Design a binder for this molecule. Sequence first.
Ligand SMILES: [Mg+2]
Ligand SMILES: [Mg+2]
Ligand SMILES: [Mg+2]
Ligand SMILES: [Mg+2]
Ligand SMILES: [Mg+2]
Ligand SMILES: [Mg+2]
Ligand SMILES: [Mg+2]
Ligand SMILES: [Mg+2]
Ligand SMILES: [Mg+2]
Ligand SMILES: [Mg+2]
Ligand SMILES: [Mg+2]
Ligand SMILES: [Mg+2]
Ligand SMILES: [Mg+2]
Ligand SMILES: [Mg+2]
Lengths: 293, 205, 170, 48, 159
Amino acid sequence: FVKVVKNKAYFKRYQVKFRRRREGKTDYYARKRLVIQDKNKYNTPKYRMIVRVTNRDIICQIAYARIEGDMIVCAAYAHELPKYGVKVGLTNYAAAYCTGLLLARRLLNRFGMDKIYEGQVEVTGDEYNVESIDGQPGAFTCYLDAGLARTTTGNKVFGALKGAVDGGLSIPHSTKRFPGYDSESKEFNAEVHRKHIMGQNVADYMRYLMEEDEDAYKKQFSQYIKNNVTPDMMEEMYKKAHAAIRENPVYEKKPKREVKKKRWNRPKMSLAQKKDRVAQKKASFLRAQERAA
Amino acid sequence: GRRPARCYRYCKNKPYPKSRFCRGVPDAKIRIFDLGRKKAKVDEFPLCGHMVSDEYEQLSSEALEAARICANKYMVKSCGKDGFHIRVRLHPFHVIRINKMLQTGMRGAFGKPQGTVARVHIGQVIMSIRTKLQNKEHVVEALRRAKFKFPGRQKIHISKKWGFTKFNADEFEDMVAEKRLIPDGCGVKYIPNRGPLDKWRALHS
Amino acid sequence: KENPMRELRIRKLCLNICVGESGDRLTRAAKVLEQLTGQTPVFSKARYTVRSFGIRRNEKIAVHCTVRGAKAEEILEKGLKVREYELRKNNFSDTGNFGFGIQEHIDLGIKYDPSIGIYGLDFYVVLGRPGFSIADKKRRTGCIGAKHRISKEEAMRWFQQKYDGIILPG
Amino acid sequence: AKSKNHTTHNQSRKWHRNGIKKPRSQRYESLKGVDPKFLRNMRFAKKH
Amino acid sequence: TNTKGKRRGTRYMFSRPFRKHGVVPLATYMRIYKKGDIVDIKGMGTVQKGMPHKCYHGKTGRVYNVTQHAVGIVVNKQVKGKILAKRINVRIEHIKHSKSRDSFLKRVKENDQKKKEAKEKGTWVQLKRQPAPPREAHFVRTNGKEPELLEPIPYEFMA
RNA sequence: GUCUACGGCCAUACCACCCUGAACGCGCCCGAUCUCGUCUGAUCUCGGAAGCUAAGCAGGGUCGGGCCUGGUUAGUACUUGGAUGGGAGACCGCCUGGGAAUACCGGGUGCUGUAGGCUU
RNA sequence: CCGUGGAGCAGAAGGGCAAAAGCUCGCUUGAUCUUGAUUUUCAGUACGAAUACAGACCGUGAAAGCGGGGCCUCACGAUC
RNA sequence: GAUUAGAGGUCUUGGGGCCGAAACGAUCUCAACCUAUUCUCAAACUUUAAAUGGGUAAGAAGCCCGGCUCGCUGGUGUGG
Ligand SMILES: [Mg+2]
Ligand SMILES: [Mg+2]
Ligand SMILES: [Mg+2]
Ligand SMILES: [Mg+2]
Ligand SMILES: [Mg+2]
Ligand SMILES: [Mg+2]
Ligand SMILES: [Mg+2]
Ligand SMILES: [Mg+2]
Ligand SMILES: [Mg+2]
Ligand SMILES: [Mg+2]
Ligand SMILES: [Mg+2]
Ligand SMILES: [Mg+2]
Ligand SMILES: [Mg+2]
Ligand SMILES: [Mg+2]
């Protein structure tokens, strides 16, 4: 025959990886270089920006590591955009930009630093970096945590990075992964980046659908038709969303509703139950076999 | 041809087995470690007798073989050709060395391999005989006359276990009747109350 | 009843030709393969050096390509038409995939060019199921469970029912 | 003319008959071997 | 004679524990060492940068300098008939806070607190840790059951 | 009661098979104009929302394997210090202290930090 | 499809290593200039080797960072 | 890494035969193989793992307050 690979010795000698590595969620090799502060800085926090693009949502958080577990100081979710105006299209590059800007403004507004470091109020999509103003508190600084995402040109993590940078946070970066960088010419097209930020790359797609096909367009953008969004008005609604975000970035928690205390999953049965079960299984097998014989 | 056995009786060196470091070791003379009707079940040879060492020493592989031959000869003479089962429970793994003299002297005096011996502790079994209940004095006499092929002092002990097993003979039969151990080959398998119920059903069906 | 989308679909079809020596034969085999598959195939270097087959270390000795979707079922239909929808019990693997070979290529709808010559090839199909991308995606990889995987019997049933073929014993 | 190669037979007695004294621990240990830029800071702070 | 290699005879000392190979847990990197902490040395073979010499393995020293990735510590080494307090630089992986000092610190806080308290009360309280005193007199009550005899068992051979 | 994002300790968390998942979510899933990358839109990247808990995932089950923690083995093995103890030796006994590990037999099968949801 | 490393990492051996220290690509020359401190043999002297820094010029990456030779343990030389 | 012995499975192959044109169709077998067991081992093996032993601490150079300096680190008279 053949050896059994998953042998008792195999399990005895097997060493499991970390839980996050087993679930595939964390790259500890990158985390070690990302979240570790220099020893002569002592307990100076090393803030970092976590951006995670989900199948239906964008998660943006600000976190610094602590022994019992890293603590989140500010967080912003893409599904909060309908409050500010973006009713649909919660995953695209524009939505990433708005959620990053919202996270930045929320941090500063919590943090008492709005009148300083306004950043790029007028979006340009070019290389911008904030400088600390003398006689005033220094600009907030953090580093991007791309996670397991492939950092190729035009990634929505970099879109969120640009959004927060225009918001006012000081994050080191280069205009190489923004949409618009042309590898061959090694140049940056701020206008192309701006149109990607404002969502024109979806507007021309919908107009392209208008050009030839209608049912395919409905299939591709069903909720767009239901929410009554047209290709031309997307730039205006994104501008309005940016204005509303910069106006009122504070977050209010939803009121808590009392629980009815209903258990939805099976509880763990006890030793007495699981022993009675095997006892009666043996009794039943014996009583069945004594007749079947 | 070989040096007297008194020159290698005490466990004076660390165990020096044959391995990738100790090469060129001549083959030990003893190759067969059990004989008789070894292809017998566990319920026909209940009586078990051990020869137990009383000294901490090292026994030569060849002396092991000589004692085995003597015991087998007496057993085939007494209890028939297949009324017993021998088992030598000592394998020679510690090789000994010799620094032969042909005149360098004691320079570079690390020996070449000469033979193999087995290190024996106090109260350790050397040979075991399993047979029927009635051949008790036959077993005792066979082991007694095999004692003369060994150095040091040895004792004969009629074990209270059943055959070559680790279970007491005075409830071995009760336990096998109750089906707590299942016979196989020349031994038994313990069946604890821990496996999946499928095995329990299989062996109670 | 049934789950509407636990059904069986082919997820990739692999074509290969192993010529055993680099050169004009190899590039012409690549040409016929790319004409058949509508895309550029790739060369595979020899893993080791064995002189019984007259090959050495790291030279291209085989040309292979993979297809998905529309072109995949068209090529598979051509191959099964050549093989008159006839397969054997041992042609199916334990994991649900299967395959076969064509001794020469111009029968399945390829014009005979005397310069390129003649070449056989191996067809292989990997039966899939919606959700098999979990086993190979990057972020949160995992197994595909026990119920969801494909067995030899399910592959046989799918082949005999969708393409009304016959599985002769052998 | 062989001879003994190495030993430490009397060494413990020789050490102990004068006693293995611990290093002279004392406050205000020297600042040599400290990070240069932190040292430069401490000098600036003391200066001002 | 022997070899003067820097890692001679460390195949077990610098090895990893059973079923504990792999990525170093980040809590070791996320600890704070200041000037003057008492700290333990335990060489870890997973990282080879800044590995302490084998003679300081298992020794306890005092931190005197903190740097980006490593720490300088003063530790005593017995050389022949004299002890030298020498300072070595160890990367942060091979280091660990000593718990022998925190017990004394907690004891200091606690007996200082109980000295501050009862100062107004005027009562007496013991602070010095006295050694284990001899057991005092007491009564052992039998509950009507007499103690059972103990006798040696007869010799009878097992092997 | 429970999930997601980031985690700490890294199997009491793993492995095999089976049963159940309300809502949100996570997913599977639908396409390749744009960004991006491949022999292949399979992976990666991007644009979505017709369908589904099938799978992942979560909870539970197995006289389950493993793992963790106890009892037994056992005051056994070994061992600090002592004797003008025994023995031809090999070794052993005692006094003064410390004191294991298999087999075998029990119990358990993730805790928890920050932020944000669902159970109106 | 299974596969905790049973392979590979130039060489002896040992330690270490799995989205890596292994394999394949892209770009480069931190194998560069410079003052000190420390460890290893030690007399606590040199050479050799090594470790943390600091000051410039750089490389790479989106970045955090990493890099002043080889994953570590050996591969080398006073005065005139 | 060495090492003895029997048990149960199959065609996974080989060896003696046998009915078979042949047929994993079939008969014994001997084997190699697999699964549970079993005897005996390691200075250059090890999951475990002592006794003896090697460091460190057992306060005034310590704790608790208030305030200054810093060109370092700094969301923050933050951290040090
Ligand atoms: Mg990375
Ligand atoms: Mg003579
Ligand atoms: Mg000797
Ligand atoms: Mg002499
Ligand atoms: Mg001398
Ligand atoms: Mg797709
Ligand atoms: Mg599911
Ligand atoms: Mg299900
Ligand atoms: Mg169990
Ligand atoms: Mg939680
Ligand atoms: Mg209700
Ligand atoms: Mg890498
Ligand atoms: Mg530098
Ligand atoms: Mg390298």
